Amino acid sequence: MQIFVKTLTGKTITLEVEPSDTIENVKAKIQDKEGIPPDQQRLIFAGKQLEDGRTLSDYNIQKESTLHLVLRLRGG
Amino acid sequence: SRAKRIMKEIQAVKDDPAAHITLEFVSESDIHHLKGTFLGPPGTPYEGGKFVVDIEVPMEYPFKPPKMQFDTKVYHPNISSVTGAICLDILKNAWSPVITLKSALISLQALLQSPEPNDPQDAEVAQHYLRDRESFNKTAALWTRLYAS
Description:
Chain A: It is found in: Cytoplasm; Nucleus. The complex is a heterodimer of chains A (76) and B (149). With 76 residues, chain A is an alpha+beta fold. Helix content of chain A is 14%, strand content 25%. The longest helix of chain A has 11 residues, at 23-33. The relative contact order of chain B is 0.18.
């Protein structure tokens, strides 16, 4: 499955996965082709945040679904 | 050019009701001054409601970030209870030049969906969410049912 990461940039990302892939491995595959820091990556999916030490199967993330990436700093 | 920028966001919101946004003008039909309005995030104190934001996207757009000031008053650490103003720094200060308003109002929807005291706006509402998980569920659910109608 190819699940789609909605950025705060314009530039939109393919994420290459099945339901066993970790939220750790989601944050590594966004730091790869975009360069976005793990503390900036506030990931949101339907009633829920994506908590970091977890599976894709915890959240009901089905094939070709949109993950909503918010870039959250510590100041403005 | 600000004229060859907003009319792409106006037509792309008109074709797609599944994205949840109205870009409804403050004059009649210009190229800049907008009520950018999203639908409320469900299973949460911000569920089911029209969340109204006044927007100057400044003169040098595509390059300048939106001045996002809420008409609908929201009890949240990153979005103002008293004034209207917002803290999220790459949305309001340090812009990427190809972010659409169809992506930026869905960023405020995802900012409300799970609250965090991290980018600070109204300082006593951030102190309240660090202290509380009972009177924040009283005040934010009442404010969504009155101000986001």
